[PDB]
Design a binder for these strands. Sequence first.
DNA 1: CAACTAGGTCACTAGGTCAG
DNA 2: CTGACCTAGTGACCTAGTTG
Lengths: 81, 81
Amino acid sequence: VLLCKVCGDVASGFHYGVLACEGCKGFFRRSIQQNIQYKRCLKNENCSIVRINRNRCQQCRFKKCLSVGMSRDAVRFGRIP
Amino acid sequence: GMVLLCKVCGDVASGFHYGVLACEGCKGFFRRSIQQNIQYKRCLKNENCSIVRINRNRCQQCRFKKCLSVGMSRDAVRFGR
DNA sequence: CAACTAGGTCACTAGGTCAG
DNA sequence: CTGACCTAGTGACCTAGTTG
Ligand SMILES: [Zn+2]
Ligand SMILES: [Zn+2]
Ligand SMILES: [Zn+2]
Ligand SMILES: [Zn+2]
């Protein structure tokens, strides 16, 4: 049913204010718990991301996350209303 | 003067819990803190932390301080009208 | 009795692991 | 570095019990 609004994979829950997979989620937290910048992207930084190529572009995977809406200020603990 | 506010995180108030207008969240969070030996792991950003809807869950320490600081207490319960 | 609230549950999910 | 799996919490919903 519901699939990750980042790489299209099956969503594991409502994470960071967005319906995402365990992969993007984990990667996402990992990304902000360290403002550390991933290397730049070789191909005009518009690397379309999918279940298959997500791990290819870190700097775009990350932006995508930001782009879709994933934040610390968007966490919805609890039960689905 | 409707839609009273949880006097801790400003979130909406579901009622008058433990002596003060609170939200299910902070409400549950309180009876949970006292009804246990629960001793939260020390604060990180200079015991002060702002508590609001978005961040309330980040520093457990301050949150509890905040509750106690607004009046929440087991002895001030009002089952009235 | 009717407008309320403690308490209890249990559906959800950050965060932390650690084996590929 | 990534992502499957757990666990300690979080808070939306209910209901037993308490007042006016
Ligand atoms: Zn994903
Ligand atoms: Zn890119
Ligand atoms: Zn609150
Ligand atoms: Zn704090």
